[PDB]
Amino acid sequence: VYSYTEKKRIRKDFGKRPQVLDVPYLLSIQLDSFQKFIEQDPEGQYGLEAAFRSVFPIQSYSGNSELQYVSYRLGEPVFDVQECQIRGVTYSAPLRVKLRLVIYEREAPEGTVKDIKEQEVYMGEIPLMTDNGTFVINGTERVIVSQLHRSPGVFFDSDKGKTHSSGKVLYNARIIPYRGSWLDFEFDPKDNLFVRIDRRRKLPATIILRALNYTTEQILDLFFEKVIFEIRDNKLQMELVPERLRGETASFDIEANGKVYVEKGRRITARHIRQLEKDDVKLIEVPVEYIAGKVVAKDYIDESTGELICAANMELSLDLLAKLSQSGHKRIETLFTNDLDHGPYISETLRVDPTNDRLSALVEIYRMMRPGEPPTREAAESLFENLFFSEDRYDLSAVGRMKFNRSLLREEIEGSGILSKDDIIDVMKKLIDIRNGKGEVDDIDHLGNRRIRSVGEMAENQFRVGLVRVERAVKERLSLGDLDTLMPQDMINAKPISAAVKEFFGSSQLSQFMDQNNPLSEITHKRRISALGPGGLTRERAGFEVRDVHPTHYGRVCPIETPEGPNIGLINSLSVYAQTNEYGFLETPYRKVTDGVVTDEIHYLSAIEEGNYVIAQANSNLDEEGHFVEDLVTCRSKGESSLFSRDQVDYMDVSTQQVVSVGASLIPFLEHDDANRALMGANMQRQAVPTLRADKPLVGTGMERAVAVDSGVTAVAKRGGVVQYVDASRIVIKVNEDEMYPGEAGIDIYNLTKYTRSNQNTCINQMPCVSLGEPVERGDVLADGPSTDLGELALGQNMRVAFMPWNGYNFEDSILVSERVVQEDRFTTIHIQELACVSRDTKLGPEEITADIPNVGEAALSKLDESGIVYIGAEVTGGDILVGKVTPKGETQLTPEEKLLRAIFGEKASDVKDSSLRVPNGVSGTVIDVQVFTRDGVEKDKRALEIEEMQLKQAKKDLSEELQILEAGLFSRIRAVLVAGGVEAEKLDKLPRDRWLELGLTDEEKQNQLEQLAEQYDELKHEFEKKLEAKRRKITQGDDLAPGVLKIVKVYLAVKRRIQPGDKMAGRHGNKGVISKINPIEDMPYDENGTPVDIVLNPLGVPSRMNIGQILETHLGMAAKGIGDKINAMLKQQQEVAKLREFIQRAYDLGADVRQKVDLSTFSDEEVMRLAENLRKGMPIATPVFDGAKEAEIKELLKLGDLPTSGQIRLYDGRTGEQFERPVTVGYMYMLKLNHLVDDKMHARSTGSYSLVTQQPLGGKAQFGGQRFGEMEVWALEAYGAAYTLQEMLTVKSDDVNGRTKMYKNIVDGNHQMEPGMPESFNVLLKEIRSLGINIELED
Amino acid sequence: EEIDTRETQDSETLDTADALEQKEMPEELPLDASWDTVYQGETTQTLQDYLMWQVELTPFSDTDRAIATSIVDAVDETGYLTVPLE
Amino acid sequence: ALLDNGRRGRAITGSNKRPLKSLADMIKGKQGRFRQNLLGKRVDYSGRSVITVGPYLRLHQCGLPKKMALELFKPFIYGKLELRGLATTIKAAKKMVEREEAVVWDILDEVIREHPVLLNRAPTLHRLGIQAFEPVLIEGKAIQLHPLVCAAYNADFDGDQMAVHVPLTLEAQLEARALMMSTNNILSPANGEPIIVPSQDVVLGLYYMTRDCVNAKGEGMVLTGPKEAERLYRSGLASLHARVKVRITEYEKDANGELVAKTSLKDTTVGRAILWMIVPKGLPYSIVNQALGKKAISKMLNTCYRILGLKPTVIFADQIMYTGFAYAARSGASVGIDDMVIPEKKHEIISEAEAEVAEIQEQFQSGLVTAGERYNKVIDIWAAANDRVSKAMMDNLQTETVINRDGQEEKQVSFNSIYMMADSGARGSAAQIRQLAGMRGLMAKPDGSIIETPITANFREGLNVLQYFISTHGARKGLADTALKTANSGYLTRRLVDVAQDLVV
Ligand SMILES: [Mg+2]
């Protein structure tokens, strides 16, 4: 089973592994994100609903009144996407929000409802996304790039000892929210904890704990443990826990029950601990010196004296032991610690901590945050409260909360969006545990720690940013008392929100003009991931490790397609099957393996979940029922791959192209190319220029149709039917009855885009690929776009190429091209340029666009019409007038000479001066389109009226096409009713249809039916009249222009560029070159039959680059062309259909257990002949990226076409006729023309315009500037010793103002001598240094 | 508006070895080259500039050149002499 | 704030949150006067465009488009038009040049007859980045460059652009001719070796024409000289590789400086005798009686320069380039998939290595050894297997069997195209051929550790997904390192120039 579009030309596939999952829609990431932003959410988690619920209600300080949000709604756009692109406006929708203002009385329970008032208010415009994932901003299509940033939550890290020369690590933890202030904890080389807020001055970690209303005893209880020493009247007999003695040595005699378990000088080992546990040794006698270094936990007070024996967190001595013994304190609390684990970090930080209270800590925090101002208790308290514990200044979003909880091994996924004491305590404990030697630090480049943020989130954030400013203004303007008459509309001004939205959508760093070289460029641009932007990284501070390929990229980020240069590793491409979680993390699909049986169940796993399983490769053999053929399979387990048993496998890959991106999946024989050359080829494939005619690759991968269809450059049938009308500019489909809606004319109309300028000044043009009266189905392709051939992507041309040296003309990546390639216009491109003329209003009077310019000859006005604008189809060159305009020159005093001039030569000459629009020098082309924009209230000229009439004609045509069908149906009904009762037979159809209305019948239901039908006819006519009137009103509307602007006129010029030496060509495998020579046809090498080659490529460029894909592609292209030649020869000498279908079946059956199956027995003879006609220039072939064809299959296909197996033939020299001494590889390659044209490169200057300040030549070809002679060139001239060349370069060529003139005069006089002076820039420097108050002067 | 600025600024004192030690990329290339290897106007030519350019390339004498300079100075933008030869 | 904005405390910004530039900003920085306008500047009489190759040019010539040359040499053309009565005023000459009449082209061809131009390619790392050439007016828009100077410019013809400057005064023109001409800059200022040495196609052609074959057409005949050898080859009566005897006359420099000639019969080939006709008098015949690679050609040029001088060396280099291109084209040397012949012992070696790895894994599972020792032993086993495979592939590649004159079988050096390209030195090395036809080998993780399981496949047979993903780590690491290191090599060279700027003999 094949569709109509595919059945016209079937591509032979060499893939062998069945596909269990279709390639998804390639633009889902944009569409889903904007849908989430714009949809209606019953809860308040996504979109505009979440942003509204995050600010409202807005309550005043008094609390007597507040504003409440009810709901929102989006109105329909005024214009369409095409209309917006033509008019140069923004495609958007108006936002309507229901607000409710409520007033509360005073001295009454709760809030008494004094009065309510509900109003729907206007918030502004919101740009809408098109069907292809773009935005039309000021008439131009734009793309917003997704961002890869760091997930919110807490992350633990440690510099690898490089900061300190001792090689000691410094652990740290960082808490980062979605919106708020960062919180950092860190260690020191002295094992002291410290806290930083917003990357500010370092503070002790005890400050925060004391700010949370905690005491020293509570801190010690939370962090350290407790040990109780008991007074038993004899040397402080102790209840000893054996576990405390691990990794320690006894400093005394340990004894119990008369048995000495541990002796002095003997360390406690595992056996000693086991014996103590078994004997349950508790009572242990210890000497006084054993308590010499212990640290007390809490405070003890002597009851008799009433004073304090000791303070918390303090050491003990023998005198203190004596004092506590006589104080009647039988219990002493100490902190159980050691050196290996349980290290003392909190105690030392407490000691270094200056404060010992709660109120002073807040003062110190205020001084840290806001120094240089007197402190206040209330100010510090409010600052600390709003820093982390306020839901208005600090949000830890749902993903942030989930990551925070998962990092600490909680049980709950959801929680509050603000921090608490427990969170901070847990973070401190986890960091201390990491320091003690248990636990691991986080990997920040792991894709489970990085998140994807798309356009919906960014739009929501900017909308909330505007909304908070609106809320602040409302709260400022609500404290006043005017509640009796105030309305919600008056209270809000919709300017800040609209300004913020426009700024984000037009001038953000991630909002860019869409790359529009070809469909692949747009697909690649819309699937781009960036680590840069607001909240990301910078290419100077990025680092080196973030730019590397990570094991978690597998299936999510393409490891190949990345820019080379400063941004390498920072811009990435999504893989083919990659998705995002609900939290924004990338996931990939896998098949599930159950008891050694590979199933068809698909599970999407993220990077965190992936590492727990054992996942098999897709290069794994399977049986008919789904069993692994072997017993040991290669699998990835925890970031590494190895062999595993058959029953130890959990998941399997779904495809062999799961790891590459869309651009990399279009390179055939990619597995034989080196990775660097593959990167270069993927980069160069998306800057090819469309040519006059499209040509399918003839060696592909099977991804061309998906790219062609999903990009939106083609016309795709919305419903099935029959082609009712076809033309070079429009298609009309007569819809099938079962796909039609009740009460409608079932026709679809497609207006094609013809010769339209793109963002890169190239041509966009659609051509039909259907015939009159043929059936179509939903999803079929009706018209090809640029670089598309019958619904397949076609970026270049098929060229006959030989690999050999040719007299030095392909030296060092040069390309030799035949003249037949030029004569056939195979690489000719169309380029379209726009020019604008603006007529403004001045104080002396308005500028006029007129054809009557007083100071030009009649010849220069021959190309202008009666409105002063050039004709359509005129051939213009540099200096010609496009739009004629004049400007008032003021009110000159009427001197006698001026009066004489006015009398003799007329008054128009003396009143205006010419300011026309002219073609720039060096520009030529044909005028193909003129557009006029007029402000409201200004009179329209003839040309604008003509354009509006042309616009109205098409709308009238479409409406008439629908109305004809509807009225024909109605009149058929009328005739059918008239048949039953008084049928006139021939007398009925002799008259026209409208004469059937003026008839009368019997008093039965026939008259009622006739009246009903006449009423329906009149209603239909009235409805279509209303439609036409609305269309005319929309067409003839005025244009909104900039202030002081009267009219704008835009002219479009089209030119054709042919191939020439200096142009850049490329293949798909990273082989790029520049054309060096165009060779006449009889100088090219040729074979036994006299057929020459098109291109000659150097074989020396293959071996060092290790891109072997091009040689295999050449061999397979030769085989495909041979099959096509067989078919063409069979067609030329008319043969039976049976022979053709037999040979084509033989061609399609070739291979080694390929998955594709084509049966021509189900094809009719007409379909067979059409397919054969489409195959007569070569049979197209598909080879997937890692499931392609082998050499044996290529040799078999060569044998089928009666071609040499080695792929090499004998060639003869064109110039001499002598045979080359060795066989040469000759075949077909797919070549591309890149957008680096030598027309846009060549530039020269002799003299010109200079800068005003520096008096030096300008820069750039557009300014006719000069070339820069930098410091390194000066060094080269110094090394040569050429003093006069350097001096002349420095003075008389750049900024010696008198020297320039003298040198020019002397050169014209034939005297090659200069008189150098002082450069002007040195004088500028002297003046600038003097302006600083420093006296610098030239001496003597 | 005024905002705080406290970021460190790189200078020449950073030794050559330290430049290669750092993993990061420099903010501005020390080498006088771009990443691939304030606005002021421009001078415009008026009628008098064109006339003086033609005077410079004409075989005059010093006295004749001074006379021509005075004459061109005495020419308005409509192309007429605004003073008598006296 | 006026004197120095941002130095003290806060910085006053504009509407778009951009700090305002003060006088100090105008003076200092990379955008200040010193770096931007005083140590370097933009100049008149300059142009730029894309460069292609001209194989017909001489070493001192360049190919300049005439549409560029018309703009570059405009005042010279004005003076020349006024000098011969074609234009009576400056405006007449201006209008004639604007209309592009047929006589202005003759004038332009007259004014550039002996007038050097300077070609420059960025970045200029040493002084050979700017050189002087005599222009030849061509049709088109690209600049044609001599193939022998590209190495000095580090240029290739895949999109590079060059800038052209015109010297104005007599002193500048004489400096361009006497100091910066390409025919004076033959030796390298860094080490003294020649820098106009041939490469690639020239090397391949000269290597191909100077090889010998065991049983070639017209073998064993006696020739009267090189001209008879050329006649035989061009008539199809003898092979370029046939081993013959030729009468050769060679000159040697005397003690007093004269050249003394001696004549003798030499055992050589047809191609060597043909090549002997472009060698200048004064050099021995032993310099061509071998298969010539890159090193041999460099030695030949150096010998010619040391013995004879400068001008003979320039003529010799031009002749060498022409002959190399001609015979490289005549050879028909190509590349095919069957040239990457894979040894038959590869699978046996891989199986043996896998068996050793399996047995050591079993030994580790028995607990006899630790983990690090097992890792090291596995690495050693795989390295030995890779060396065995490389040796087998190279031994199979470099020889072939030919039928002797009497009907025997002999071994000779292979005429395989890839082997010929690598052996001569035209392109490629041993490691790249090993990757093409042996195995990729052991790879490394981004941290630097070696992955235990190597890539046992080569590029002819193709990799799978896992192996390609593994190779991407090293590919990207190398690319990023290359993109980074240039910015600090620039630091190094700037500091070196700054410390030794003023030292003069
Ligand atoms: Mg290049």
Curated annotation (Swiss-Prot), chain A:
Keyword line: Acetylation, Antibiotic resistance, DNA-directed RNA polymerase, Nucleotidyltransferase, Transcription, Transferase
GO cellular component annotations of the record: cytoplasm; cytosol; cytosolic DNA-directed RNA polymerase complex; membrane; transcription elongation factor complex
Signal peptide: none
UniProt cross-references to InterPro entries, sorted A to Z: DNA-dir_RNA_pol_bsu_ext_1_sf (IPR042107), DNA-dir_RNA_pol_bsu_external_1 (IPR019462), DNA-dir_RNA_pol_su2 (IPR015712), DNA-dir_RNAP_su2_dom (IPR007120), DNA-dir_RNAP_su2_hyb_sf (IPR037033), RNA_pol_bsu_bac (IPR010243), RNA_pol_bsu_CS (IPR007121), RNA_pol_bsu_protrusion (IPR007644)
Listed Pfam families: RNA_pol_Rpb2_1, RNA_pol_Rpb2_2, RNA_pol_Rpb2_3, RNA_pol_Rpb2_45, RNA_pol_Rpb2_6, RNA_pol_Rpb2_7
Impact noted for substituting residue 812 to K: Disrupts the enzyme's active center
A single MF term (Gene Ontology): ribonucleoside binding
UniProt effect for mutating residue 679 to M: Resistant to antibiotics salinamide A and B
One Gene Ontology term from the biological process aspect of the record: submerged biofilm formation
Disulfide bonds: none
PTM statement from Swiss-Prot or TrEMBL: Acetylated on several lysine residues in the presence of glucose.
Residue numbers of N6-acetyllysine PTMs: 1021, 1199
Gene3D superfamilies: 2.40.50.100, 2.40.50.150, 3.90.1100.10, 6.10.140.1670, DNA-directed RNA polymerase, beta subunit, external 1 domain, DNA-directed RNA polymerase, subunit 2, domain 6, RNA polymerase alpha subunit dimerisation domain, RNA polymerase Rpb2, domain 2
Transmembrane feature ranges: none
Catalytic function, reaction form: RNA(n) + a ribonucleoside 5'-triphosphate = RNA(n+1) + diphosphate
UniProt KW Magnesium keyword: no
Keyword hit for Lyase: no
Biotech use, per record: Co-administration of salinamide and rifampicin or salinamide and myxopyronin suppresses the emergence of resistance to both antibiotics.
EC number: 2.7.7.6
Purpose of the protein: DNA-dependent RNA polymerase (RNAP) catalyzes the transcription of DNA into RNA using the four ribonucleoside triphosphates as substrates.
Similarity section: Belongs to the RNA polymerase beta chain family.
HAMAP family named among the record's database cross-references: RNApol_bact_RpoB
Protein name (record): DNA-directed RNA polymerase subunit beta
Gene source species: Escherichia coli (strain K12)
Lineage: Bacteria, Pseudomonadati, Pseudomonadota, Gammaproteobacteria, Enterobacterales
Curated annotation (Swiss-Prot), chain B:
Tree of life domain: Bacteria
Summary of the function given for this chain in its UniProt record: Sigma factors are initiation factors that promote the attachment of RNA polymerase to specific initiation sites and are then released. This sigma factor is responsible for the expression of enzymes involved in arginine catabolism. The open complex (sigma-54 and core RNA polymerase) serves as the receptor for the receipt of the melting signal from the remotely bound activator protein GlnG(NtrC).
Composition-biased stretches (Basic and acidic residues): 1-9
S-S bridge residues: none
Sequence segments annotated as region (Disordered): 1-14
Residue numbers of the full-length protein present here: 54 to 159 of 477
Family the entry assigns: Belongs to the sigma-54 factor family.
Species the sequence originates in: Escherichia coli (strain K12)
Protein name as annotated: RNA polymerase sigma-54 factor
From Swiss-Prot, chain C:
Membrane spanning stretches: none
Binding positions for Mg(2+) per the UniProt entry: 156, 158, 160
Subunit structure: The RNAP catalytic core consists of 2 alpha, 1 beta, 1 beta' and 1 omega subunit. When a sigma factor is associated with the core the holoenzyme is formed, which can initiate transcription.
Function: DNA-dependent RNA polymerase catalyzes the transcription of DNA into RNA using the four ribonucleoside triphosphates as substrates.
Family of this protein: Belongs to the RNA polymerase beta' chain family.
Protein name according to UniProt: DNA-directed RNA polymerase subunit beta'
Organism field: Escherichia coli O157:H7
Name of the encoding gene: rpoC
Region of the whole protein represented: 305 to 809 of 1407
